[PDB]
Design a protein around this ligand. Structure first.
Ligand SMILES: NC(=O)C1=CN([C@@H]2O[C@H](COP(=O)(O)OP(=O)(O)OC[C@H]3O[C@@H](n4cnc5c(N)ncnc54)[C@H](O)[C@@H]3O)[C@@H](O)[C@H]2O)C=CC1
Ligand SMILES: Cc1cc2nc3c(=O)[nH]c(=O)nc-3n(C[C@H](O)[C@H](O)[C@H](O)COP(=O)(O)O)c2cc1C
Ligand code: SF4
Ligand code: SF4
Ligand code: SF4
Ligand code: FES
Ligand code: FES
Ligand SMILES: [K+]
Lengths: 213, 44, 430, 230
């Protein structure tokens, strides 16, 4: 959680890191997405891509991103420390993030938090000794009508109870991957008592088009 | 046949970690040329 | 018309909101999307701007600025720099999840809105800044963009109109403050997401220094329907200066939390009791409602009876429409804990560039934790009010106002509850 | 001429287009309080001390970054301007450590002088203050980051004048810190000038440490002979 860096033996500028050639081609596409003279605008994706190659960002991907984009490393340090997704400390294989803002707290998300804490035997911000799960607390993740909700890696698991999140953890520990969706009856965001709107079939092309167009 | 009972957004169950970047790489061939500011960098 | 609500399914902007139909190009084109777009692009940017501003469409981001004037701000001859349209797909405000549904189930509507807006203001390309958490939504949006590129709808000679328009998707990195337009512009440029000072406005200097117009996903996706159906049809709904339809996300202590499209001037009680199935324990169990997400103050049960869910009626009730995110709290809720959690969210999501928010929001976080615990005195309460008056209006961006408003609303509507908590703590500890 | 007429407290004054409110007030002879503004650095506009009230405008504007408009009436001594100054001083002094007797900037501190002039006289902060870990940037500049007010003159000087680009703000919110983020020393030929531009006692001169006090020193104006610049 510290915003300063100390050279540990496992995290130092001499730690080996380098992009794979397919990641290099992805980097060239990303820097081609931007106008010339503004290559630093590709600092945000490319550095994230480095995390997508490693799972965490030591200070060797920071310097490599600064080197391949011709920017000072202090700007890359600012970008990595400002945003919350960039892991400057090695997290476990499955990064569980539980939303505990007010709309999710109103639908009993703390029960999910203590259920995960009891099942995994760890606390918030701790990692399992097998380096499999990392449990932290996040803000609103944009699925407030499906509260309570967690996010594991890139996937969203919504409308959960303690039994559902225990089943999610059991499926993750067995080596499988669950379905990233709400655990209740509804599919994405419809009311649980059936479709209160959009029951009629869509009209199609040319419906209601004004004259003179 | 009109059907209002199934969920058609099922492709995201099969998306990998590099799906967005490979999609951008495939899209890179369709893009128009970018404008230039006349210099390599503001520090140039 | 004086009574509003009960919108028919034929008048909905966002058909296939719940993803029940195909979201790809074949499914979107069969629902009316990408239909006669060449005529829209060839009828003229001034015609598109006139059709937009005739409908009375306001900004759906939460500010409520008239989008016709805002889009016509950059309708000026070029001076060698390119012009850019930027789509705000962050949606970090608590209670708000409508843009996720728009970019997940109707991406081609967003792409067509990008093309129509870019033709309207002569923009070179579109930069859609999606949230970092929304990986699957970003992948679906990129798939739809690739499908539009392959069919010749966007890119070089877009839809056979002689106009060249590219669409780009930039993923965020998990910052709520990056949702605001100037901080979003700085985030696209590869810097820290810290807001700029206006003036200069983004229409003068925006992304990369080029002229830029930042617009919400919802206010962009409606524009092809504005151009096709006409402005008078959109202006038929809602009250005066509150025209159109709105996506409402109802959550909190309700029977069925859901996202639903409805008219602009719907009563709040009718909307909750019709689309959400009513609150838990019946309408007599309602304690408070936050109508527009965490940026807007709450209103109590007495205000909620005869309030309309548009901009003007909520401004009259000392609140705002915001993003139309209705968070409902029943009588079994520690509302002081909810407001303290909102202030803690604002403390954790704050860019920290400028002094009043950077110190004051932490000050309210500490004093609201003390208020929740009851370890305070009543004379502090008015002092806290003064602290809010030292944050609102003295900040670079509007996160300070959006953090000061919930404290003011909580104080104004529930001062006796806080005083009772403090006197109970004083009795039980002394 | 293309000069425009603005008003400071009802007094008319001609200014060039693009002139800020602070520059117009300096032209009429009034020094608006400032922390992050510097006439040889780029405009940041984050300390919010230069907030002034324009007449018939219901929002205070930052005078260090607001260009003047024709017919604007600037009120530098109005009631809400003083209210904004007092509030910004309260926010700035909420987390500052009680270090004035043991700080080398005492007696020439900008924060002390503007707190005495434009600020209030008592504190309502009943909570605990923050503490920032000290940094090392070489044997020339003594660093006490607890006294920093995040004015960002460090990065502006190191990026625009020194041309080093080694300082920056790491973190977010109240945990935002100014530093190099690594064990690096800021050794340029113009490094010590940051000690001149820090308005607080965060960056002090290490050879000068704990030796004298500004009120008891006699100033003699002389010419440097270390080089041929003069
Ligand atoms: N949608 C969301 O996630 C959130 C929305 N909000 C809401 O958003 C609002 C605060 O956001 P802001 O962007 O600061 O709103 P507002 O102050 O800025 O302005 C909205 C737009 O109008 C433009 N504009 C306004 N006056 C102008 C002028 N004279 N000249 C040129 N352009 C002008 C601005 O550049 C901006 O693009 C509040 O209503 C708040 O409730 C707040 C938090 C989150
Ligand atoms: C702290 C903060 C966060 C914001 N987040 C968003 C957001 O996530 N999405 C959005 O569309 N607008 C957001 N806004 C509002 C924008 O400043 C701006 O109003 C919006 O991008 C465009 O508004 P429009 O609908 O009138 O075009 C935010 C504003 C603030 C102050
Ligand atoms: S009000 Fe807060 S979030 Fe906004 S610019 Fe100031 S410090 Fe940043
Ligand atoms: S910097 Fe100024 S206010 Fe802070 S301890 Fe030193 S003299 Fe006091
Ligand atoms: S150390 Fe001094 S000059 Fe540097 S940012 Fe802080 S207050 Fe400003
Ligand atoms: S409040 Fe939890 S997802 Fe929004
Ligand atoms: S001097 Fe203008 S905000 Fe600091
Ligand atoms: K100093």
């Amino acid at each position: 959680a510290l915003f300063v860096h100390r050279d540990t033996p496992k995290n130092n500028p001499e730690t080996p890191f380098d992009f794979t050639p397919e990641n290099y081609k992805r980097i060239e596409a990303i820097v081609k997405n931007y106008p010339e003279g503004h290559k630093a605008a590709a600092v945000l994706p490319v550095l994230d891509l480095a995390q997508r190659q490693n799972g965490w960002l030591p200070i060797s991907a920071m310097n490599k991103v600064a080197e391949i984009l011709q920017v000072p490393p202090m700007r890359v340090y600012e970008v990595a420390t400002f945003y919350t997704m960039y892991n400057r400390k090695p997290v476990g294989k499955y990064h569980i993030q539980v939303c505990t803002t007010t709309p999710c707290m109103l639908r009993n998300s703390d029960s999910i938090l203590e259920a995960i804490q009891k099942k995994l035997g760890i606390k918030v911000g701790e990692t399992t000794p097998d380096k499999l799960f990392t449990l932290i607390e996040v803000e609103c993740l944009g699925a407030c009508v499906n509260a309570p909700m967690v996010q594991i890696n890139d996937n969203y698991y919504e409308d959960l109870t303690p039994k559902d999140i225990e089943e999610i953890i059991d499926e993750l520990k067995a080596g499988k991957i669950p379905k990233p969706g709400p655990r209740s009856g509804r599919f994405s965001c419809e009311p649980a008592g059936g479709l209160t709107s959009l029951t009629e079939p869509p009209k199609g092309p040319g419906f209601g088009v004004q004259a003179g167009l | 046949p009109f059907d209002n009972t199934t969920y058609k957004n099922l492709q995201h169950h099969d998306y990998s970690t590099y799906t967005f970047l490979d999609l951008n790489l495939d899209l890179s061939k369709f893009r128009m040329p970018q404008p230039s500011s006349g210099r390599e960098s503001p520090r140039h | 018309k004086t009574s509003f609500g009960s919108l028919k399914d034929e008048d909905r902007i966002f058909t296939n909101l719940y993803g029940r139909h195909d979201w790809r190009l074949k499914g979107a084109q069969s629902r009316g999307d990408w239909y006669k777009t060449k005529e829209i692009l060839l009828k003229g940017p001034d015609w598109i701007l006139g059709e937009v501003k005739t409908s009375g469409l306001r900004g759906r981001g939460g500010a409520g600025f008239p989008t016709g004037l805002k889009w016509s701000f950059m309708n000026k001859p070029s001076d060698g720099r390119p012009k850019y349209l930027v789509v705000n797909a962050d949606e970090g405000e608590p209670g708000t999840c409508k843009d996720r549904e728009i970019i997940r189930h109707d991406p081609h509507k967003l792409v067509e809105g990008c093309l129509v807006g870019g033709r309207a203001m002569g923009a070179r390309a579109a930069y859609i800044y999606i949230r970092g958490e929304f990986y699957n939504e970003a992948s679906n949006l990129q798939v739809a963009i690739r499908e539009a590129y392959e069919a010749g709808l966007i890119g070089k000679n877009a839809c056979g109109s002689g106009y060249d328009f590219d669409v780009f998707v930039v993923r965020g990195a998990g910052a709520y403050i990056c949702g605001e337009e100037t901080a979003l512009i700085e985030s696209i440029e590869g810097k820290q997401g810290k807001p700029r000072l206006k003036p200069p406005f983004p229409a003068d200097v925006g992304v990369f220094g080029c002229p830029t117009t930042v617009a919400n996903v919802e206010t962009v996706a409606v524009s092809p329907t504005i151009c096709r159906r006409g402005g008078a049809w959109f202006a038929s709904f809602g009250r005066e200066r509150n025209s159109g339809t709105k996506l409402f996300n109802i959550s909190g202590h309700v029977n069925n939390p859901c996202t639903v499209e409805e008219e602009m001037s719907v009563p709040l009680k009718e909307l909750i009791e019709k689309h959400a199935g009513g609150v838990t324990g019946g309408w007599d169990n309602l304690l408070a409602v936050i109508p527009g997400g965490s940026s807007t103050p709450l209103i109590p049960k007495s205000v909620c009876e005869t309030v309309l869910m548009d901009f003007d009626a909520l401004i009259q009730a000392q609140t705002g429409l915001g993003t139309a995110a209705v968070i409902v709290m029943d009588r079994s809720t520690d509302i002081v804990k909810a407001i303290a959690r909102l202030i803690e969210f604002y403390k954790h999501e704050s860019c920290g560039q400028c002094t009043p928010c950077r110190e004051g929001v932490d000050w309210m976080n500490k004093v609201m934790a003390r208020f929740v615990r009851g370890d305070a005195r009543p004379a502090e309460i008015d002092s806290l009010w003064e602290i809010s008056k030292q944050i609102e209006g003295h900040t670079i961006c509007a996160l300070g106002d959006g953090a000061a408003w919930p404290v003011q609303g909580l104080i104004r509507h529930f001062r006796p509850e806080l005083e009772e908590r403090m006197q109970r703590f004083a009795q039980q500890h002394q | 001429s293309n000069l425009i007429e603005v008003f400071v407290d009802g007094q008319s004054v001609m200014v060039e287009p693009g002139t800020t409110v602070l520059q117009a007030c300096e032209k009429v002879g009034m020094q608006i309080p400032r922390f992050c503004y510097h006439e040889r650095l780029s405009v940041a506009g984050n300390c919010r001390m230069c907030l002034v009230e324009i007449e018939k405008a219901p929002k205070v504007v930052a005078a260090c970054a607001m260009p003047v408009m024709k017919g604007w009436n600037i009120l530098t001594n109005s009631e809400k301007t003083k209210k904004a100054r007092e509030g910004v001083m309260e926010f700035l002094l909420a987390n500052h450590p009680l270090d004035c007797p043991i700080c080398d900037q005492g007696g020439e501190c900008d924060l002390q002088d503007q707190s005495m002039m434009f600020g209030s006289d008592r504190s309502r902060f009943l909570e605990g203050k923050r503490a920032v870990e000290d940094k090392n940037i070489g044997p020339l500049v003594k660093t006490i980051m607890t006294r920093c007010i995040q004015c960002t003159r460090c990065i502006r000087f190191a990026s625009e004048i020194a041309g080093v680009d080694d300082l920056g703000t790491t973190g977010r919110g109240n945990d935002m810190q100014v530093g190099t983020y690594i064990e690096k020393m800021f050794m340029s030929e113009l490094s010590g000038n940051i000690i001149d531009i820090c308005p607080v006692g965060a960056l002090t001169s290490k050879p000068y440490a704990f030796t004298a006090r500004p009120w008891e020193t006699r100033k003699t104006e002389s010419i440097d002979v270390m080089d041929a610049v003069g």
